[PDB]
Amino acid sequence: YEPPDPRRMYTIMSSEEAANGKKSHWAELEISGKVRSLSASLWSLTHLTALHLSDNSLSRIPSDIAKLHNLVYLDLSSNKIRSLPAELGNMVSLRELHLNNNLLRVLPFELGKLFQLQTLGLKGNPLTQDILNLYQEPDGTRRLLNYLLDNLSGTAKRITTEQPPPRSWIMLQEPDRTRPTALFSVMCYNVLCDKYATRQLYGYCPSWALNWDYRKKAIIQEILSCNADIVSLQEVETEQYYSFFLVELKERGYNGFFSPKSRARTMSEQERKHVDGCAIFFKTEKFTLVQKHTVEFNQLAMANSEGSEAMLNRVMTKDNIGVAVLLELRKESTEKQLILVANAHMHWDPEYSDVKLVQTMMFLSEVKNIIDKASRNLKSSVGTIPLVLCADLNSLPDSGVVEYLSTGGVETNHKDFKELRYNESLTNFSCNGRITHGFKLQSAYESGLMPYTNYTFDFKGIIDYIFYSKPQLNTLGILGPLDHHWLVENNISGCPHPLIPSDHFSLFAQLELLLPFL
């Protein structure tokens, strides 16, 4: 049972081994060289059954250490470790651990779950006075694990003692009946992909509430509750779209279109599995897709000039960060009126406003060209096509990124352009001293009916939006915010939260389109 004290290899005797020829099974490994960190390919050795990481300069321990489900021994003596992970409690098979001469303040409560741990070493660590008192008692090893397991009951994960009140609905207008009209509901939701949903960012959020298997079920219960005739999503891992979101949503009657944010990487499958992107769904009973697009800049539509080239370098990013689809209203819910529905996500942070601002002009400028390409052949006569735009611009409502959309244009000197103020190349994107575009859009949640669409610990603001062409479209109602008083009763510092799957809130809003003639 004891591992051999000599850390030396052993060879089978030649005469007996060679004749029998049994294979070489090595189950023990050592790591030395006062290494600073560890590698990921180490956690792939599931066959290992005893690991010697003693006498190193290991700062921390990854959670993927638990990937050695067969491990029955572990040594971390004389290392520079500050604390242990929580996933260590899932290594039941472990039967002996050593933590001597480290910088351990308090052991994780999950450690008591290791009911097979017969021996434990702790000499040389700064542990609470009481922990050192239990370890001295006879059979203090068993006694201490029971204590750490007694404290794990204090955490009481998934109590869920609170209850979520429903979100209220607000009415902005009645549906006028002067002319025939079409009414369809829209949703916008940034589901917070798993790749960027770490605890380092959302530290107020327990690990079981961050688990994608836990959120993905609560997310979908939200998209189905709203039953929007159009659903627009952001931060959706490609794997999860095809194998989860598009699966569960077809059962309810949707047909979606996805597109990843990056295509030129061409990484391995595993890398490509967790790439996120923007998806658009729609009820078939009301819509019928006529086209699909993944927005990109042709890069030649502008007048070939060194300045535009010199500029675009500072701005362009390999990610397309944009998706759009063209739909068709079915006769029953001659003219054949269509609707373009766009979806976008700006990852960049507020400090890079010049990128987000030019990227936005870039995005919309490409939209206008896509509409014209379809408004020629498919439009019955000449020939306007509406635009239902929903995006997560990661921009507040006063920002320039948002000024460009609401006011129909932005000044060439806007604070957000920063170094790019007055660059001649910017004037090209408009259709002077100001950049304008043909669209005349209007926000669906104007007047700040939702105080904030992203509620984190350090940031509260409005970054998700739903726009529309005012001459064509109107909004009859929007889904108001969560009872703010509830957020206080429960001391919710930020999101995600046991009861709140994403870090954003959903934007369900009802629209109205004008039908002429028959």
Binding site: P4, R7, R8, M9, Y10, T11, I12, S14, E17, G21, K22, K23, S24, H25, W26, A27, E28, L29, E30, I31, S32, G33, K34, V35, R36, S37, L38, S39, S41, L42, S44, S57, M267, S268
Partner: protein, 253 residues
């Protein structure tokens, strides 16, 4: 100025050149400097040489190559016009990645620009593709030279396959035969010759070969490996090597 430093910025350009130089200069010497050894298994082994592979397995899979050097020459033993050797400097991050402390100390004294490697290092994944298209590897009539090349070719397989090394010591050889039909380990040849022992620099003194570039660097060592092979072939082997006997043998394996 035979040696040439290769970084990610000036990589794809050089590969275009090597594509054309390899036709007339098919013999290639190779050496790599890596973040030392860190891991050693314990357990029953079929043979001492069997362990040696298992040892080489763990560390190749676990660590990233730091620098590579390749000297292209013809069967006569002549360097091509222009730069003779290319020193490939890989993207090794001093913080995130793993390495033995003493191993980094030696590479600092050798002159590796660690910080410049992180910022302007070569992405191994992409480099593999270019080396694949060039055709140096996996081409009938291309022969490979190397000294203490267990780890050397170890890392090269992981790069080109982008996978951990096979478990079976047999599975590792069968793959090595394809990418490199003909290999000659310089040390395995020294076993046959008399009065030849020790490290590489010790061999250079016996054979009176001047040292060009920074000693104990991947690029410089690669150049010294190739020249030390031609004069060794002309001297102890009479300008000829028996393939079947010495082709495909790596010292310690």
């Amino acid at each position: 100025q035979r040696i040439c430093e290769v970084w990610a910025c000036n990589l794809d350009e050089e590969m275009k050149k090597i594509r054309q130089v390899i036709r007339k200069y098919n013999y290639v010497a190779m050496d790599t400097e890596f973040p030392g050894v860190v891991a050693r298994p314990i357990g029953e082994f079929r043979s001492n040489a069997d362990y040696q592979y298992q040892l080489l397995r763990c560390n190749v899979d676990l660590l990233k190559i730091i620098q590579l050097g390749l000297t292209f020459m013809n069967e006569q033993g002549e360097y091509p016009p222009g730069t003779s050797t290319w020193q490939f400097n890989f993207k090794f991050n001093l913080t995130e990645d793993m390495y033995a402390q003493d191993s980094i100390e030696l590479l600092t004294t050798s002159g590796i620009q660690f910080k410049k490697h992180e910022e302007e290092g070569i992405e191994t994944q992409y480099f593999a593709e270019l080396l694949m298209t060039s055709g140096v590897v996996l081409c009938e009539g291309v022969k490979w030279l190397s000294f203490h090349s267990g780890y050397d070719f170890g890392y090269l397989i992981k790069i080109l396959t982008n996978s951990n090394l096979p478990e079976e010591e047999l599975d590792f050889f069968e793959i090595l035969r394809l990418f490199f039909p003909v290999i000659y380990d310089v040390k395995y040849l020294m076993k046959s010759c008399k009065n030849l022992k020790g490290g590489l620099q010790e061999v250079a003194e016996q054979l009176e070969l001047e040292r060009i570039g920074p000693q104990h660097q991947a690029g410089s060592d690669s150049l010294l490996t190739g020249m030390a092979f031609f004069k060794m072939r002309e001297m102890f082997f009479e300008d000829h090597i028996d393939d079947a006997k010495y082709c495909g043998h790596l010292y310690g394996l």
